């Protein structure tokens, strides 16, 4: 299955958001990150992807597709926008949950990640 995440200046969560900011997918599913507004990108957060996964980074304004196969959670962020974060989950019982949940980001970033994990049933 293929899924889309839009990069937006504003959403229910406030300014600078991935929408949806949380997505549960099956191994082999894909997510394309699509800038609805200019000035955004996507990249994985250091330490926040599974063993077996590769990091990634898009260019500002680039439409960017990633295939997810390694099971676990994947924290992603937008470079210019500190609170702009999201979580892609592959499978159930992710094994690297604490990598995201136990991290020490600025509060508004960390609460958005934490909300994303809780919405994914964790
Ligand atoms: Cl593009
Ligand atoms: Cu952004």
UniProtKB/Swiss-Prot annotation:
Its cofactor is Cu cation. Keywords: Copper, Electron transport, Metal-binding, Periplasm, Signal, Transport. The keyword Signal applies. The keyword Signal applies. Disulfide bonds: none annotated. GO terms for cellular component: periplasmic space. Binds 1 copper ion per subunit. Residues 5-91 form the Plastocyanin-like domain. GO terms for molecular function: copper ion binding; electron transfer activity. Its main location: periplasm. It comes from the Bacteria. It is found in: Periplasm. Cu cation binds at residues 40, 78, 81, 84. This soluble electron transfer copper protein is required for the inactivation of copper-containing nitrite reductase in the presence of oxygen. This is Pseudoazurin. It comes from Achromobacter cycloclastes. The lineage of its organism: Bacteria, Pseudomonadati, Pseudomonadota, Betaproteobacteria, Burkholderiales. The chain holds residues 29 to 152 of 152 of the full protein.
């Amino acid at each position: 299955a293929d899924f889309e995440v839009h990069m937006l200046n504003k959403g229910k969560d406030g300014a600078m958001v991935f929408e949806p900011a949380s997505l549960k997918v099956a191994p082999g599913d894909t997510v394309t990150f699509i800038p609805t507004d200019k000035g955004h990108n996507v990249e994985t957060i250091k330490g926040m992807i599974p063993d077996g996964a590769e990091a990634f980074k898009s260019k500002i304004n680039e439409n960017y597709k990633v295939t997810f196969t390694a099971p676990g959670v994947y924290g992603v962020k937008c470079t210019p926008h500190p609170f702009m974060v999201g979580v892609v989950q592959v499978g159930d019982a992710p094994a690297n949950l604490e990598a995201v949940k136990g991290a020490k980001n600025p509060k508004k970033a960390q609460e958005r990640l934490d909300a994303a994990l809780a919405a994914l049933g964790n």
